[PDB]
Amino acid sequence: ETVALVVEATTEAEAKKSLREGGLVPAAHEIMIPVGNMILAVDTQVLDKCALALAASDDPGRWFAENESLIHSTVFAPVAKGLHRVYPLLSVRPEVPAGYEASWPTQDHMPGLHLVVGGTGAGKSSYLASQDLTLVIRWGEPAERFDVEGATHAVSDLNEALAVAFVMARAGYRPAIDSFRNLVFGIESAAGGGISTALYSAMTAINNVCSRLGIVVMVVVNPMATEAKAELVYNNMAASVAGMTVLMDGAVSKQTVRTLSGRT
């Protein structure tokens, strides 16, 4: 259950071990998540251990508070260096598990991300606080009023943000991440309204982890698009995920959702 931090495989026998152990071959319960030039991994056994403990608990708020570190351990960054070579141009398999059904965020919503997008000050963070959410995971944003009085959980890195969201959604709760600010800032690639196009692939990768898990996670993203190129940028963002809600001046201006039987 311990993650290798420094020591990676140097022999072929060691290279065959799990990512957790410092090898190069995912175990059956490890899914790699490419994000820019990083490769993370979710351990779906740890994930469902935590999610089941939450969902089955007589006091899930208390279990959460007492096991935050275990929850955060669901997603980690493997130590082995050769992953980019061994798995070229890695993505995540687009899947929908058998018997998937959804009423939230909308009826028959495809599993994946539901993005809440808009410019600086558009009201995305406030929009969340008015949806019927279980928990807002606060990451990479300056401390605001949202952090003093709401149902929030503050985290420090992308492992923690994804771990809490995955565990909460797998348990049957409704999580949102506010926000992917540090992905927008951190990811760099060939541009297409000045947007690093690797942002789109990162959102698709995380989206498809959600799809394989049969969950929807709501996520705030300010892509930093100029006024002219915002329509194109939002279209490419919507084409990368299951659903999108656009905020302009505190009001919803557009919403599009891929559904099990269509696209709305």
Add this chain to the structure above:
Amino acid sequence: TVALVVEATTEAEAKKSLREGGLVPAAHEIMIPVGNMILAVDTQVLDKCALALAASDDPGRWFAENESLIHSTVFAPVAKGLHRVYPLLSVRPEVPAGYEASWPTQDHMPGLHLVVGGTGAGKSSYLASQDLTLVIRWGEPAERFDVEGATHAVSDLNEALAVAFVMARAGYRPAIDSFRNLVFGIESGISTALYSAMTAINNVCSRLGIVVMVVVNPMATEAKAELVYNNMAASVAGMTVLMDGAVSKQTVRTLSGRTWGVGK
């Protein structure tokens, strides 16, 4: 098995196959340069798998049950010196003796047939008109296509190529939806290394006597689309451009000449 971490450090080891961590391709290894990556296909493992798949009752099930053989069919060699030893590597353009084609068009050169166009141009739904055996889904978000239809989802470029190669050598008709991560991941008004990557993969298909259909959204601007589309067309056997759900342009290199098409 493929060597994952131990590479040649002596001249004797360097003479061994790419699979074994050496620098010299064995009789049945073909190197595939893709951007700054170098992959390899083992044509003996390939035709092994193609024979096994040909006697299968479910192509889709065979692939899901044989991920070990697929990763043996196309892999990324561990030896670091390949870029230096094989300067400006491509794949040699060949046509096997006795090659015949009626799909996608009559006398179509073996190679890639690109299905290209902008976001939401209808490329994914266009594949439904092409009498394909199945669509290999890669790098795209989970969509209606992935739950209703003959698809096989993969995670990386080795897997996408291996499945398509095995399918085509067995006599089936594959498409890859899509090469999105080549567009985003290759960086060098599009990076010229996208064009050489398509020529390299195209010529592997030419050596194998196969045609693989491939979706590409190049993320070009309206001003530069016409240029980027010619550059793409000059890299491959054939190309079909979609706009707003309809074919607007087509060009195919054939065994004795060239065809063109113009629509709306």
Add this chain to the structure above:
Amino acid sequence: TVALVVEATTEAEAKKSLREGGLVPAAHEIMIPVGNMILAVDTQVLDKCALALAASDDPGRWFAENESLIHSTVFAPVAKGLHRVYPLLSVRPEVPAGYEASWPTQDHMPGLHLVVGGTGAGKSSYLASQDLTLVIRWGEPAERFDVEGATHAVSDLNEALAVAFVMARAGYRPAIDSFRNLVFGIESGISTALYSAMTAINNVCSRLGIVVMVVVNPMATEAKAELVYNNMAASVAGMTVLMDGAVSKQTVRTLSGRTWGVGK
């Protein structure tokens, strides 16, 4: 003492504190990502120093006599793998229980209060109106401010942060003049990594329940000033813009809302 050159090379060493050359923060270590750098504050050493400073007759003299303790309070960990282990690291946004503020404004969120504007806008002299305990001078040329007035000059970002943190935890009011070297030294129409660096430092202040005033000349063009100033304001608790010696704009995030100001 802080490890300067020997870092963890075994899994057992990796579990040790950042101070000791490991990769896992001890109970009282908080990582501070700044561009491609990762610093750490030790909150136990911090409150040690804050108690010692609180019983001092000269804050300025105490700092000059305790450079060893200051370099123990904020330091740059030696272990190289931190960027990989903690992906897209930020600082978690928190507000300590019982936090109260009347300075710089009523109910001001803990965080940074930026004093911003172009060259010669009057930022350094503006600090004289803010009832500060002293101005921490960093990255600026020797000026009249440095010979006449309550200043303490430092050389690097660890020192600037440590002095400000110790001062504020002890109940004094610090300003840093200036973050010039963050503007110049962070590079990635301003580098987006300046914004994430300010959010990270801001949220360390939020966790500590303090406000630190900080001068920033972002070197933006007249055309882009309005945009860069919103991006800066969206990264921190509060911001005051100077033009030609006068406040032209202000915005502050408070415990229950937001304030704005407009001048000439």
Add this chain to the structure above:
Amino acid sequence: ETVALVVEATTEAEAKKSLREGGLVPAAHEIMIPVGNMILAVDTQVLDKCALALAASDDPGRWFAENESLIHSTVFAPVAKGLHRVYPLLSVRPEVPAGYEASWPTQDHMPGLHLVVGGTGAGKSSYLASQDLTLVIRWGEPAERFDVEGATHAVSDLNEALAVAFVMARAGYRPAIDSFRNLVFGIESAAGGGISTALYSAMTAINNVCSRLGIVVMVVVNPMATEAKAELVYNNMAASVAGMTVLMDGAVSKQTVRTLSGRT
């Protein structure tokens, strides 16, 4: 006759050995060829061994087919890392061997490259198939009709392309390379119509190998120049080599050749 692939000189005694052996000092029969950031080497003893065997053979087509690997071994990429330092800003000596004469491509043509240049689709590949050539070496281009029925030889990398061209021309035959596409794509430097100026130096380096060898090699180059800047780009290309033919819409539009007694 074996080329060092992994093991390079680590002592001064080893550094004095030939490039073939992993040393840093060319033997009398090794000529280094700088191409972008690469350094190749032609072994002129292997070259003239192959060329003489071809030229003296009762069945040169059969000798070629039976010795393709030996032919390809004429040019290799040395393993030693310090070559760029030891030979700063390396080029190739401009020489014309005593008693040089030429009737092909034109009368009294300077030894060197004869470039066939023009934009995408301009008819360069077809132009070759109408010159009185012995062999077209196909490299880096997608498989086309040219590869099914003509006198062609398909290769994979720049070593092979140069080896076959040098050997064929030294034997008294007339070779062309279609094309230097992967040099245009692969080489990057300070631009001057957007053309990486290291393209010009690569063509001069290869040109001067041809001049030292007393041969002319015809080479297709599509420099990817915009319409506006094509006149300047073609002029700089002509200034880098012995001769140039420009194709526009399948017709020759300009031709310029440096001659032993003038410039036409």
Add this chain to the structure above:
Amino acid sequence: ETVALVVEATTEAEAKKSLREGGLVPAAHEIMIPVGNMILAVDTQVLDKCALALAASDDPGRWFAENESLIHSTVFAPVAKGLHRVYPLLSVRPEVPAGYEASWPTQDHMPGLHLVVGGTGAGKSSYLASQDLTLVIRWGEPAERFDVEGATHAVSDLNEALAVAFVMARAGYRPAIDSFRNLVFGIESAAGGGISTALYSAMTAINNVCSRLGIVVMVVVNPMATEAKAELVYNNMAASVAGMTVLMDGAVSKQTVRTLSGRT
């Protein structure tokens, strides 16, 4: 007194030694000087040894000529690699020593640099030869008439230029450096009239060494600003140092000096 050139600290005990010895911790008489991505160090004991020997000498010109190498050893580049990490965003402390007084270049001039700025051919070098200077240190400029007949001392690198200037000024003489040409060329960072903004921080760092030493050094700087953006660039240069004189067509057009009691 010997400087470590190759061997740096590899243990914590060694890391605690002086920069001269290959450690990471400045001795009490070492001041680090960040310049772009370099870190130099001035040894103030060697500095004042040389300066006192000069100032006390019955024949200071002869002592200078006989001890040039010792003078040049006052500033060196430490060998230890971790300095950028250990001292994040390093600058130099802005200080003015107690009892500082100045009549040169102007009355009550702040200690620091006095920049002589202007475009190519503006007359900066000639301007120096008309000020009442003791010595012009010539660095990085092509040999000109200034080097044949004047009171000059030619040096090769930034250590030597700073060493001679510091020693001369500490001895009570009046030095100028003509010029910082290689800093302008060598330093690269995010731009703000195309000027690498790390140029401003380098000038502030060197300025503050002068301020800590209670000296003024005159320095020629041609920032290579375009005509349009020169006013802004000169303003940012003046904001980085104690004083500035601008030359246009061989005449002084602007002069600004920070004084102990004001700014002129």
Add this chain to the structure above:
Amino acid sequence: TVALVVEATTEAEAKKSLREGGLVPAAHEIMIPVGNMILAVDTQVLDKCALALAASDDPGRWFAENESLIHSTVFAPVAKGLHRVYPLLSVRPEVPAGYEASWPTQDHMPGLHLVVGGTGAGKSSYLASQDLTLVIRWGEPAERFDVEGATHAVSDLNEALAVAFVMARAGYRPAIDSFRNLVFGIESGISTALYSAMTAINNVCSRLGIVVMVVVNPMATEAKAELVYNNMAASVAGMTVLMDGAVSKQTVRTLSGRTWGVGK
């Protein structure tokens, strides 16, 4: 002999000469920084060769028979730390006592005399009017100049400099045609490192009391030519601009002043 691969790893080895793999120039070694490269001339070997050449019946034959001595005269030191130890290295501007000049012009400063202009401006043929001893051909395609005329062809920058230095110290008049590969190979509207490279080589000539004529095609645009030509002229002793075969501008720094010329 020059060390090619073994460099200093102890402080004792570091004190040895550059030739021997150390970091400290011997009495007669002068470092020559060129872009990111650092070369060295050994002035004792130089004057050895100049005496031998002076008693030669064919300068051209002497050079071809003494490639070993030429590579001992200018070489690239193996030690890696030189950039750090000698920050922003240049060459000190000097004029030897007793220097006199009548070529290329009266009282011409020792240094480079650049012959500059665009493609086909007539720079190579202009050298025929300058009463040269021979033209050192480097980096240019084989031309009529190379078969008819007094030329000596070389391959790299060490060779070009060494031949020119030896020729000039022996009393002959060398020109280098051309520095093309400095223009293409130095990259940092021209890279400013071209200008500092010319100043460094210029000042080596100044220390040696020689003038070397050098052709440069800087590849500037018509809009930027005037600026790039001043920047080049401000880097060297003298410069002549060619347009369409005729001198259009000239400037020369002399022992006591400056000359200028204007043509068509």
